[PDB]
Point group: C2
Chain length 259, copies 2
């Protein structure tokens, strides 16, 4: 008995809706509804990084989408890494519209390990890594304005287990990420047990993730326990690129279990 | 093995991203490749309304061509609408191009000009299936931009390509400013001494469109190239449906016109 479901996919830093193309295809092909979103200044979003210094505007595309969702319609919300922040806010704001939330190697802050804590730890693994660089559109007196992912950083830390053509796709598509202030992030993402915590949650681990160490990972899982943790072996950070079929079946299974 | 430099130019709605399979094959084989985004294409910062003049659309390529030291020749590949862009580049920097390749591209010449090839190309897209136009200059002025619908992409463009590539494109196609024939005709002027001096190869690649193939045959007849090659089983986006074949063809062309 087929039950049509609605998957909503949220990308990580530098990326956009385009990174899910293999997953979007498998979904639409099986009869499910899927929405892959471009966050602020991501993918083909019209905004430029410098134009959106407020974290609020980076998340607006998902919040607007969440608000426009029809009555009584539930979705399986999936966030990849940094996208974890975006969906956490969506969970806190519209808990009743989310069947189950999935954190794919996602930043999963909780009441006992706030957003800024997770953002600082995350920042350390990206800033200064290989050829990644920052800009100073506001002068040396102020914090760097944006972060730009380098091709070597992508090939080594993110796409090391993915098809080489996927690496080429990424280099031609990744955009700068405005370096949002922790203070601003801390005010936008505030989670409570009664709302955020009432949403079924599952975390997916990428066994060969070289972008986000398992140390930091186990920390979030331990300090903000999900309803379940699943693994995907042989996957690098971008599971949707390196292990698409496995991620797809894992998502259908998760969808079925929490419907 | 002589290292070479391939410069790829996309067609309407697309961007440098559509060449990802070809770009991957060239880098791994040792060659250098540049996949550019034209104005308001791919991740180019401009929005269609900001580039109402065709010159604005071509700027990323003209700009790239100028930065090239005359001694570093390239193989310039233009796809479909991209044919107009490389034609302009052929006229301005003729000596920097070893050979110019038109992948089912618009190939205007002295006998069949830019406005002619354009009007024809546009009739195959405007009003087709779920495509639509916008009016940012008011309801009384001609439409400003053309947007590619997903059904049109599935049926008329990616019909012979992997389903994921259709999904990829639906997530990345951007609007195209509806340039004026008058602007285009004035921007794309070609002369036998410059444009005509560049080695030119046309690649035929289309499958279930007799009229499309006819139009393509009309340009080859009116503006004869130095050679015509063919690729079978390709839909509109050969780089998606027949990657390995397109790649092989490009290397062959490159090794022959050093
Ligand atoms: C505190 C500054 C905000 C910037 C957030 C940096 C963290 C991004 C983590 C995701 C890494 C990736 C390649 O997906
Ligand atoms: C004078 C009209 C110029 C605008 C014509 C736009 C149509 C694009 C045709 C090329 C087909 C394609 C997208 O590959």
């Amino acid at each position: 008995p087929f039950v049509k479901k609605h998957f909503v996919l949220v990308h990580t830093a530098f990326h956009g809706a385009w990174c899910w193309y293999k997953i979007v295809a498998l979904m639409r092909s099986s009869g499910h509804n899927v929405t892959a979103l471009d966050l602020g200044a991501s993918g083909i979003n019209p905004k430029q990084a410098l134009q959106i210094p407020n974290f609020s505007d980076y998340l607006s595309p998902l919040m607007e989408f969440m608000a426009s969702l029809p009555a009584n319609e539930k979705i399986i919300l999936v966030g990849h890494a940094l996208g974890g922040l975006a969906i956490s806010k969506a969970m806190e704001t519209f808990p009743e519209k989310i069947s189950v939330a999935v954190f794919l190697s996602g930043l999963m802050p909780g009441p006992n390990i706030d957003a800024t804590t997770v953002c600082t730890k995350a920042g350390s693994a990206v800033l200064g890594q290989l050829d990644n660089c920052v800009t100073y559109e506001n002068g040396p007196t102020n914090p760097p304005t944006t972060l730009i992912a380098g091709p070597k950083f992508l090939a080594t830390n993110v796409y090391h287990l993915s098809p080489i053509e996927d690496l080429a796709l990424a280099t031609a598509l990744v955009r700068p990420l405005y370096l949002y202030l922790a203070e601003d992030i801390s005010k936008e993402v505030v989670l409570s047990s009664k709302r955020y915590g009432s949403v079924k949650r599952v975390f997916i681990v990428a066994t060969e993730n070289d972008a986000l160490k398992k140390e930091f990972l186990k920390l979030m899982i331990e300090k903000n326990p999900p309803d379940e943790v699943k693994e995907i072996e042989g996957s690098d950070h971008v599971t949707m690129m390196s292990k698409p079929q496995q991620l797809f079946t894992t998502l259908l299974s998760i969808a079925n279990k929490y419907k």
